[PDB]
Design a protein around this ligand. Structure first.
Ligand code: HEM
Ligand SMILES: [Xe]
Ligand SMILES: [Xe]
Ligand SMILES: [Xe]
Ligand SMILES: [Xe]
Length: 148
């Protein structure tokens, strides 16, 4: 699958500095959808501003978790069946924490933003399409967690 190799090659670049890259993703996310900020409630407190989130080790750990789940998806690009059940429960978990399935569209745009910014000219039309398909497949599996 040529799509899979474009994903593998672009991810190599990102995966070298995952927290730095995931930081861009989350900064962009809160800039687009500020109402996601209160959902991260560590030690029973909510973050007042997006910059507060960046000072939180728990929040930064969650960036690492996100980048790890993406890494699993890239590893399993040719077949996400090994990941379907895990991703369904991951959706269920995010439903429980208060995330609306609708917000995963903004997450997608934030992912594509991070990739465009990191890769520059190497973020070709084909690369963008490949990532949009992989992300779509991930969200499809996660969406099963929202009761159906
Ligand atoms: C809309 C954006 C998101 C929000 C508001 C959100 C919120 C949360 C919260 C509150 C937790 C529990 C606290 C914690 O573990 O730090 C969590 C856990 C987690 N998140 Fe997210 N999340 C988002 C997106 C994602 C995405 C897209 C992924 C996958 C690529 C992801 C991967 C994970 C993982 C692996 C955990 C640990 C779940 C567990 O095993 O308990 N997160 N998230
Ligand atoms: Xe952020
Ligand atoms: Xe963790
Ligand atoms: Xe993501
Ligand atoms: Xe993804």
């Amino acid at each position: 699958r040529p799509e899979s190799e474009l994903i593998r090659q672009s991810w190599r670049v990102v995966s070298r500095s995952p927290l730095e890259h995931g930081t861009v993703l989350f900064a962009r996310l809160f800039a687009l959808e500020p109402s996601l900020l209160p959902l991260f409630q560590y030690n029973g407190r909510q973050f007042s501003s997006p910059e507060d989130s960046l000072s939180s080790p728990e929040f930064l750990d969650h960036i690492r978790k996100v980048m790890l789940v993406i890494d699993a998806a890239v590893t399993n690009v040719e077949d996400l069946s090994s990941l379907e059940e895990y991703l369904t429960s991951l959706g269920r978990k995010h439903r429980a924490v208060g995330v609306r399935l609708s917000s995963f569209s903004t997450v997608g745009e934030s992912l594509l933003y991070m990739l465009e910014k990191s890769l520059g000219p190497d973020f070709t039309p084909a690369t963008r399409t490949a990532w949009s398909r992989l992300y779509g497949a991930v969200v499809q599996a996660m969406s099963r967690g929202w009761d159906g």
